[PDB]
Each structure stands twice: as C-alpha cells, then as structure tokens.
Write an enzyme that holds these catalytic residues in place. Structure first.
Site, short mmCIF file in Angstrom:
data_model
loop_
_atom_site.label_atom_id
_atom_site.label_comp_id
_atom_site.label_asym_id
_atom_site.label_seq_id
_atom_site.Cartn_x
_atom_site.Cartn_y
_atom_site.Cartn_z
CB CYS A 187 36.36 -138.33 36.02
SG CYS A 187 36.52 -136.81 35.03
O1 VO4 Z 1 33.10 -135.80 34.77
V1 VO4 Z 1 31.57 -135.48 33.69
O2 VO4 Z 1 30.49 -137.06 33.73
O3 VO4 Z 1 30.55 -134.04 34.41
O4 VO4 Z 1 32.07 -135.10 31.89
#
Ligand code: VO4
Length: 149
Positions: A93
């Site tokens: 992410c």
């Molecule tokens: O992938 V998070 O926006 O829950 O740190």
C-alpha cells in the site's frame, strides 16, 4: 534482494510502496504485484510494471480502511493463481502496512489455513505495524468465519 519486503511464505511478501528508482529491484525479485493504493496516490503510472513484464492487480483500498470481504477474496484468489504459476507476489500500500498487513494475514489464513490468532502473530512479528484498525481486524474475523464454513 529488495530488503524492505517481508515474506510471509516462500512466494508472498509485503512492503511499503516502491519508488520509481526501486522498480527494477522489485521486478527482479517479483513477477506479480498487488497494488492496494488509489491511482491518485501513485508517483508513477502502473504501466511502469507492464513495461517490465510484471503482472499487476490494482485493487484500491482507501487509507485507514478495510476491504470488503468480497474484495479480499478476489485478491486472495488472484495471488493464489499467481503462486500456482510459480510467480512471487509482492503486496503493498503506502507506508502504513495496515492494508498490506491485512492482506498478508489473510493470505496465511487462505493458503495455509492458519487461525487468525496465529496468522496475525506471524505478520506482526514481521512488521509490528501490520493490521492497524478494527475494521481491518474485523474483515479478517469475517474471513475466518467464511473459511471454516
Ligand atoms: O494501510 V493504512 O491507511 O490502515 O496505514
């Protein structure tokens, strides 16, 4: 070997987002990538992976949010198909590791059948930041319920 990645098994790792100058590093080691971040938060086009012959799943999850269970199962079936073909898969992410850690935990439950308490322990042993919010944990509890049935 790209050292910001952490492997949960022989074939699946999770990390923060690679920057542009790290794309070749990661293409060397991984044949597939699961991108959990929205297109607008990317510093390069995902076509950077296509031009290197890397297969991409773009399944965006908003920051600090959990996927639905349907979204999480689609992601897991896709990883499973890639690992089936002998590819190594990087999940990422941004920096938070909430979303990527959630998918990592789920992969252990889906592929190895680990109970949530053990899969969560493994991933958080790798990155103390994995699975950041209650909705992330809850979707994992929902996944466990789904698999045991
Ligand atoms: O992938 V998070 O926006 O829950 O740190």
């Amino acid at each position: 070997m790209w050292p910001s990645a952490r492997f949960v098994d022989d074939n699946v790792a999770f990390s923060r987002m690679p920057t542009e100058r790290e794309l070749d590093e990661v293409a060397k080691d991984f044949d597939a990538v699961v991108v959990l971040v929205e297109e607008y938060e990317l510093p390069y086009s995902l076509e950077e992976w296509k031009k290197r012959g890397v297969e991409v799943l773009h399944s965006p999850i908003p920051d600090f949010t959990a996927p639905s269970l349907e979204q999480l199962l689609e992601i897991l079936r896709w990883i499973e198909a890639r690992v089936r073909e002998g590819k190594k898969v990087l999940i990422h992410c941004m920096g938070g590791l909430g979303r990527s850690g959630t998918v990592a935990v789920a992969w252990l439950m889906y592929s190895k059948g680990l109970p949530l308490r053990e899969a969560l322990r493994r991933v958080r042993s790798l990155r103390p930041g994995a699975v950041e919010t209650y909705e992330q944990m809850e979707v994992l509890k929902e996944l466990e319920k789904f698999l045991r049935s």
